[PDB]
Amino acid sequence: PTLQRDVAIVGAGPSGLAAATALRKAGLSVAVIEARDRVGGRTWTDTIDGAVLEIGGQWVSPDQTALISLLDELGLKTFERYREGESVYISSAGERTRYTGDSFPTNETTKKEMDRLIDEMDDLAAQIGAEEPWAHPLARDLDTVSFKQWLINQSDDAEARDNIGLFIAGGMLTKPAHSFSALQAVLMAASAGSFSHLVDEDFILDKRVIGGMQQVSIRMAEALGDDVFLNAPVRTVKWNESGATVLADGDIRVEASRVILAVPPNLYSRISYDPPLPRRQHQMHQHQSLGLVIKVHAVYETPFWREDGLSGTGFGASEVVQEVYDNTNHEDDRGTLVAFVSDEKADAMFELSAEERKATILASLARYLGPKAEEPVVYYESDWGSEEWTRGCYAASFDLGGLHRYGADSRTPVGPIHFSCSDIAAEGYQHVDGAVRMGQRTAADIIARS
Amino acid sequence: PTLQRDVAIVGAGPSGLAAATALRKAGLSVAVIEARDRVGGRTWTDTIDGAVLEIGGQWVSPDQTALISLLDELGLKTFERYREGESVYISSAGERTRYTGDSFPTNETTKKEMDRLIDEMDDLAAQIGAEEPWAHPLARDLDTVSFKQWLINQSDDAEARDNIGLFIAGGMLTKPAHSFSALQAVLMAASAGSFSHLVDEDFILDKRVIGGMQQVSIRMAEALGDDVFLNAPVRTVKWNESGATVLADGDIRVEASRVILAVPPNLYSRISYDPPLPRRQHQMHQHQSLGLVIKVHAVYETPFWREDGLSGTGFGASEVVQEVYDNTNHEDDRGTLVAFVSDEKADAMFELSAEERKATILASLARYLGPKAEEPVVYYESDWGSEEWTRGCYAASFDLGGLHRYGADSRTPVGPIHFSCSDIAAEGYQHVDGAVRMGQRTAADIIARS
Ligand SMILES: Cc1cc2nc3c(=O)[nH]c(=O)nc-3n(C[C@H](O)[C@H](O)[C@H](O)COP(=O)(O)OP(=O)(O)OC[C@H]3O[C@@H](n4cnc5c(N)ncnc54)[C@H](O)[C@@H]3O)c2cc1C
Ligand SMILES: Cc1cc2nc3c(=O)[nH]c(=O)nc-3n(C[C@H](O)[C@H](O)[C@H](O)COP(=O)(O)OP(=O)(O)OC[C@H]3O[C@@H](n4cnc5c(N)ncnc54)[C@H](O)[C@@H]3O)c2cc1C
């Protein structure tokens, strides 16, 4: 077909659907043109070997007020990750300690250096913010030193530095700490409300969606009916000052006044622009790259770790698997774990065969929770890197130096072309809440323009 | 044959030969009955693929005054290990730094904790001594805690503790720090004159023997002529209050007034005693075990590292190879390295094939000295563990708790049976100088008895 709308939206992940929702509410027409056979993008619930898994994003935290509002508006309810009993810490030397409380069971020197680092990061985050960290007068100094070098300059304590990196590098940006700047760490902290928020798994990994996070996108997409187009990769955006024509597979052709490119930034150059985007965009987009993390899912006859007095939460910056949590489905009698293998360690596991890789990862899970972790009934690894319409995970960030160099331009419309994804968000950066915020912000921009 | 002597000496390593030498000087007759086809025991020079190597012990330090006296008496001269230029340090994180000076190029916290640990060890060594560390009133407290636990109680700094262990555990006792006590570390330090002596490779690995250390034993054995018997494993010691009959392969039978068992203590029970030794000995001997270390020898067309401004000395407590030094032969134009792989890391390398093991070790040498270390013209690994008449290296020590429990009995004659090896020595413990001292001490004991 060919059709005419106020706004063509490329991508039906949560940012594109949030924008579509808001645009409709204010009386604008939309088409949402989506490449895959489903909506949700980096959120995806599927049944794998008889187990319902959240293959993509899943967690809701208390700072994420725009997602929490939306969940309400869609009739979605939440439940909390299980947290009773003891967590497990694996030291830099490989020693396992069960513990409770807000600090890791390390030697006192490391424990004092960690608290100091956490406080300094909280102070920087509070002063610098997530809206425009590049405009702060500290921006150039912080953005031209890697987070690894900045940590070394702050502290002689190797274990504290490794644990501080655990929460930002493997835990959030999913890139090695040598490869991103101290200002990018500060933005990551500020975006979650504080660095202390990223340290506390009871805050950042607090709740999940009954029904699964993919329902958020599914329900916004339902409300839009035939205005959503699936299995339609956008190939071409012809534009001028008055409008755009979007062309997609299946001979689709949408003529609209504005376009929202609601895709992560590494994928912008998948589309031919006619005329080309400006030099500024051609350069900036090359400096954006997603991280890499394997989300590991292991399903067992029972949550066996609870019988041992454990919450299922483990942290070990020196393990192949640096984080493991109880991810048992709501109302399920079977126990499920989720675990993460980040950046260069994800590279290293993908070099092994799937069978050696599984055994390696399960051996690491057994160091936290015991040998029963090696006998799951369903094992699955999310594999977002293989997916041409994602190509990595959780989210995209600048290379070292790119945030201060290009950050102020990362949300700017090129004439009728607008940009909206979690990867360029302020609060909620890299998460569903940031996709939602950015979709709503882009809608209000377009609305006021009209 | 059958023969009669004042003293039968079992073993022609340096302790047994030193004892034989001294006994002759005072007018006593001896036979020295040796199992292998050569003298020297744990000292052995051989030509391997056209390169002269010191397969066993080799180094002389300035504290080793009884060996230095002996070298003089035998006309042997010494030369110093090459030490010009920069050393290499590999950190707990795997970072290589070239340096000079007396301290490692670590962060300042680790550097301050190392100096403190070194001082405390020096103080304990000075107060406790190497003659009878079990008689000090601190002996029980220090001997019932492992050196690993004692270090943890002294310091929160993982890198300092690992480096302190490098000098005692992998560097000397060749057992893991969890397996021996703090009192055994203190004895090791005291035996070399101080712990600072064990830290400074320019002291403890100062000189070598022109001609090779095996010449020390060869020349004492020469002076004894036909009184040395080779290829004669001792099988049986029949004894009573008046004397002993020693029986060895080749139908040898020595009737003597006293016997010196000049073998490391793990081998005492290779010989049948008639009547059996006392309970005290039957128990004590079971608590003595040699360590394990692979002495790696790599020969190159030139000492190539000198062209890069390096001494060839490297330290890396977290590497498979923890120590590497310039071991170039005196007057040789070809460069030779010596390196060490200790205890559980030696176990781990012996589980690989000889070819994977070689490649592993050379890869580690290349982390210190660059890729040219992977292209040697002769590669050889000393393999003392396979040798039935040694079975490990450098030397034997008590299990955890054995030093205080049994140390006071470790040099006591059983009637006509005397004990003499480096492994029970005081100054020079575990080294050729301690074998020499013990041989001389045993001679003077026997002499005064007569
Ligand atoms: C393993 C993993 C776990 C995660 N866990 C969490 C979590 O616990 N909590 C949290 O908040 N967030 C989490 N996230 C992140 C969250 O999933 C993403 O931030 C959010 O989904 C991004 O939303 P988006 O709308 O900005 O982009 P996407 O979700 O990536 O949507 C982009 C959409 O555009 C489509 N598209 C791309 N190119 C084209 C084209 N040319 N033509 C047409 N369509 C196109 C894609 O197919 C896709 O549907 C996780 C992410 C991953 C990968
Ligand atoms: C790889 C390695 C490197 C070393 N480096 C150094 C160093 O650099 N500096 C240093 O001072 N020391 C070093 N040493 C230690 C030194 O070599 C030993 O401490 C010293 O050789 C021990 O002397 P011994 O006379 O006490 O025993 P040994 O040298 O072991 O002599 C024991 C002798 O008794 C024989 N024997 C055993 N059982 C019988 C039997 N039943 N019948 C007959 N004969 C028997 C053996 O064959 C052997 O010849 C090193 C040792 C090794 C293994």
Side-chain angles (χ1 to χ4, degrees):
Chain A
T2 95
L3 35 157
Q4 303 85 231
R5 299 284 192 276
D6 293 312
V7 186
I9 298 161
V10 180
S15 198
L17 295 163
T21 310
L23 287 164
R24 278 283 199 76
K25 187 160 312 181
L28 280 60
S29 72
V30 313
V32 180
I33 320 159
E34 164 59 45
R36 288 172 155 115
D37 66 7
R38 67 172 179 82
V39 296
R42 266 175 289 173
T43 61
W44 182 19
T45 303
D46 205 6
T47 297
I48 267 80
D49 201 356
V52 176
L53 300 173
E54 301 197 72
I55 307 296
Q58 58 160 258
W59 283 289
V60 188
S61 54
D63 54 303
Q64 293 177 345
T65 55
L67 178 57
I68 288 161
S69 282
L70 179 54
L71 284 176
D72 207 47
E73 170 206 308
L74 299 168
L76 278 172
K77 303 284 195 218
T78 61
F79 70 103
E80 79 169 32
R81 178 188 35 86
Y82 177 88
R83 71 201 56 192
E84 295 172 29
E86 286 186 320
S87 304
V88 178
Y89 177 75
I90 304 177
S91 72
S92 288
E95 178 196 7
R96 172 205 192 244
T97 304
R98 303 162 50 132
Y99 76 92
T100 51
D102 273 277
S103 76
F104 291 141
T106 62
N107 71 269
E108 294 294 318
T109 304
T110 291
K111 170 168 338 186
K112 279 158 184 153
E113 286 293 281
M114 315 220 46
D115 286 338
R116 198 176 58 76
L117 295 169
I118 288 159
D119 296 341
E120 165 75 315
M121 291 295 291
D122 280 352
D123 293 340
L124 289 169
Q127 291 174 33
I128 288 173
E131 180 60 29
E132 42 176 11
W134 48 80
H136 202 271
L138 302 161
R140 191 162 177 84
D141 290 351
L142 287 177
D143 200 56
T144 52
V145 61
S146 72
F147 192 46
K148 178 191 186 183
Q149 181 68 51
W150 183 84
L151 281 172
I152 289 159
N153 292 346
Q154 308 323 122
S155 185
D156 284 348
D157 201 272
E159 190 164 6
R161 285 184 320 228
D162 287 343
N163 286 336
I164 289 287
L166 178 159
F167 293 122
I168 297 271
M172 288 290 143
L173 288 181
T174 68
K175 283 174 168 180
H178 55 84
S179 77
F180 60 79
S181 72
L183 185 71
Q184 287 183 94
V186 170
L187 158 68
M188 190 69 243
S191 86
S194 64
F195 190 89
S196 292
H197 290 165
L198 307 175
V199 168
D200 178 13
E201 73 294 353
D202 290 349
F203 187 104
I204 182 79
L205 276 20
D206 186 24
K207 295 177 172 156
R208 288 168 72 185
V209 183
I210 295 179
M213 179 72 66
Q214 197 194 357
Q215 271 292 306
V216 178
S217 291
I218 281 157
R219 298 193 192 180
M220 276 188 299
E222 276 177 351
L224 295 174
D226 279 315
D227 281 340
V228 178
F229 297 70
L230 299 183
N231 302 282
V234 175
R235 291 326 181 175
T236 310
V237 170
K238 306 206 222 279
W239 60 288
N240 59 42
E241 306 276 46
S242 77
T245 298
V246 181
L247 315 176
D249 287 11
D251 196 41
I252 300 186
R253 163 164 182 125
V254 186
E255 303 162 352
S257 306
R258 320 281 194 244
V259 182
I260 306 178
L261 296 182
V263 310
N266 62 300
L267 297 178
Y268 293 149
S269 82
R270 293 302 290 113
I271 296 177
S272 298
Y273 304 87
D274 180 357
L277 300 177
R279 182 174 24 244
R280 182 50 164 186
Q281 284 76 29
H282 273 345
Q283 286 267 130
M284 165 167 52
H285 298 165
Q286 294 181 60
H287 291 282
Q288 290 260 36
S289 56
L290 293 168
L292 188 55
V293 59
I294 306 172
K295 181 178 182 173
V296 183
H297 300 82
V299 190
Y300 304 86
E301 272 316 312
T302 69
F304 63 81
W305 47 94
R306 305 186 185 175
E307 292 150 26
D308 300 307
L310 308 170
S311 59
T313 293
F315 291 101
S318 287
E319 281 290 316
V320 325
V321 166
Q322 73 156 222
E323 305 156 72
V324 58
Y325 312 91
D326 191 308
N327 204 208
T328 302
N329 283 340
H330 183 61
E331 304 286 19
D332 204 339
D333 61 301
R334 285 190 306 178
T336 300
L337 286 178
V338 64
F340 300 104
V341 181
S342 178
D343 63 95
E344 305 182 289
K345 294 166 171 182
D347 290 17
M349 291 300 99
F350 288 131
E351 287 180 13
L352 300 164
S353 68
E355 169 172 85
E356 204 182 340
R357 168 166 63 267
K358 176 186 174 174
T360 296
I361 290 180
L362 289 180
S364 190
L365 296 197
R367 284 174 216 110
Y368 293 92
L369 305 172
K372 290 178 185 200
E374 291 174 305
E375 305 291 12
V377 297
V378 169
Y379 177 80
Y380 179 69
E381 297 168 357
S382 296
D383 181 18
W384 294 94
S386 293
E387 286 295 320
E388 72 169 300
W389 306 107
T390 307
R391 301 187 184 211
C393 37
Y394 300 126
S397 53
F398 281 107
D399 59 8
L400 201 153
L403 177 62
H404 87 283
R405 181 163 178 190
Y406 300 106
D409 292 341
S410 66
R411 295 189 288 251
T412 315
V414 172
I417 312 182
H418 286 70
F419 297 92
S420 190
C421 58
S422 60
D423 319 73
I424 64 180
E427 306 157 55
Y429 173 58
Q430 295 210 335
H431 289 64
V432 179
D433 176 75
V436 181
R437 291 175 197 273
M438 272 308 299
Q440 299 165 358
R441 281 165 62 144
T442 304
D445 186 14
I446 292 173
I447 289 163
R449 287 173 184 236
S450 294
Chain B
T2 95
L3 35 157
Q4 303 85 231
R5 299 284 192 276
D6 293 312
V7 186
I9 298 161
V10 180
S15 198
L17 295 163
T21 310
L23 287 164
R24 278 283 199 76
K25 187 160 312 181
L28 280 60
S29 72
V30 313
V32 180
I33 320 159
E34 164 59 45
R36 288 172 155 115
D37 66 7
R38 67 172 179 82
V39 296
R42 266 175 289 173
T43 61
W44 182 19
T45 303
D46 205 6
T47 297
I48 267 80
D49 201 356
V52 176
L53 300 173
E54 301 197 72
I55 307 296
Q58 58 160 258
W59 283 289
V60 188
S61 54
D63 54 303
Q64 293 177 345
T65 55
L67 178 57
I68 288 161
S69 282
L70 179 54
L71 284 176
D72 207 47
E73 170 206 308
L74 299 168
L76 278 172
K77 303 284 195 218
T78 61
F79 70 103
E80 79 169 32
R81 178 188 35 86
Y82 177 88
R83 71 201 56 192
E84 295 172 29
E86 286 186 320
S87 304
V88 178
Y89 177 75
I90 304 177
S91 72
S92 288
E95 178 196 7
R96 172 205 192 244
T97 304
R98 303 162 50 132
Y99 76 92
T100 51
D102 273 277
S103 76
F104 291 141
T106 62
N107 71 269
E108 294 294 318
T109 304
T110 291
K111 170 168 338 186
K112 279 158 184 153
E113 286 293 281
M114 315 220 46
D115 286 338
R116 198 176 58 76
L117 295 169
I118 288 159
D119 296 341
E120 165 75 315
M121 291 295 291
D122 280 352
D123 293 340
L124 289 169
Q127 291 174 33
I128 288 173
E131 180 60 29
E132 42 176 11
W134 48 80
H136 202 271
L138 302 161
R140 191 162 177 84
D141 290 351
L142 287 177
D143 200 56
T144 52
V145 61
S146 72
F147 192 46
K148 178 191 186 183
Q149 181 68 51
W150 183 84
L151 281 172
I152 289 159
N153 292 346
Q154 308 323 122
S155 185
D156 284 348
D157 201 272
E159 190 164 6
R161 285 184 320 228
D162 287 343
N163 286 336
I164 289 287
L166 178 159
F167 293 122
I168 297 271
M172 288 290 143
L173 288 181
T174 68
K175 283 174 168 180
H178 55 84
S179 77
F180 60 79
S181 72
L183 185 71
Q184 287 183 94
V186 170
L187 158 68
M188 190 69 243
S191 86
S194 64
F195 190 89
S196 292
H197 290 165
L198 307 175
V199 168
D200 178 13
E201 73 294 353
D202 290 349
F203 187 104
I204 182 79
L205 276 20
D206 186 24
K207 295 177 172 156
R208 288 168 72 185
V209 183
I210 295 179
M213 179 72 66
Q214 197 194 357
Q215 271 292 306
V216 178
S217 291
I218 281 157
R219 298 193 192 180
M220 276 188 299
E222 276 177 351
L224 295 174
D226 279 315
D227 281 340
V228 178
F229 297 70
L230 299 183
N231 302 282
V234 175
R235 291 326 181 175
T236 310
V237 170
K238 306 206 222 279
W239 60 288
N240 59 42
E241 306 276 46
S242 77
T245 298
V246 181
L247 315 176
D249 287 11
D251 196 41
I252 300 186
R253 163 164 182 125
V254 186
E255 303 162 352
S257 306
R258 320 281 194 244
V259 182
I260 306 178
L261 296 182
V263 310
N266 62 300
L267 297 178
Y268 293 149
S269 82
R270 293 302 290 113
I271 296 177
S272 298
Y273 304 87
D274 180 357
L277 300 177
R279 182 174 24 244
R280 182 50 164 186
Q281 284 76 29
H282 273 345
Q283 286 267 130
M284 165 167 52
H285 298 165
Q286 294 181 60
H287 291 282
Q288 290 260 36
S289 56
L290 293 168
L292 188 55
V293 59
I294 306 172
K295 181 178 182 173
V296 183
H297 300 82
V299 190
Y300 304 86
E301 272 316 312
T302 69
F304 63 81
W305 47 94
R306 305 186 185 175
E307 292 150 26
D308 300 307
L310 308 170
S311 59
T313 293
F315 291 101
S318 287
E319 281 290 316
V320 325
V321 166
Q322 73 156 222
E323 305 156 72
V324 58
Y325 312 91
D326 191 308
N327 204 208
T328 302
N329 283 340
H330 183 61
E331 304 286 19
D332 204 339
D333 61 301
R334 285 190 306 178
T336 300
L337 286 178
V338 64
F340 300 104
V341 181
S342 178
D343 63 95
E344 305 182 289
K345 294 166 171 182
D347 290 17
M349 291 300 99
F350 288 131
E351 287 180 13
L352 300 164
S353 68
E355 169 172 85
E356 204 182 340
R357 168 166 63 267
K358 176 186 174 174
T360 296
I361 290 180
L362 289 180
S364 190
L365 296 197
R367 284 174 216 110
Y368 293 92
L369 305 172
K372 290 178 185 200
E374 291 174 305
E375 305 291 12
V377 297
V378 169
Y379 177 80
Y380 179 69
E381 297 168 357
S382 296
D383 181 18
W384 294 94
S386 293
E387 286 295 320
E388 72 169 300
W389 306 107
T390 307
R391 301 187 184 211
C393 37
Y394 300 126
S397 53
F398 281 107
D399 59 8
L400 201 153
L403 177 62
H404 87 283
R405 181 163 178 190
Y406 300 106
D409 292 341
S410 66
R411 295 189 288 251
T412 315
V414 172
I417 312 182
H418 286 70
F419 297 92
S420 190
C421 58
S422 60
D423 319 73
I424 64 180
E427 306 157 55
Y429 173 58
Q430 295 210 335
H431 289 64
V432 179
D433 176 75
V436 181
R437 291 175 197 273
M438 272 308 299
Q440 299 165 358
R441 281 165 62 144
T442 304
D445 186 14
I446 292 173
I447 289 163
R449 287 173 184 236
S450 294

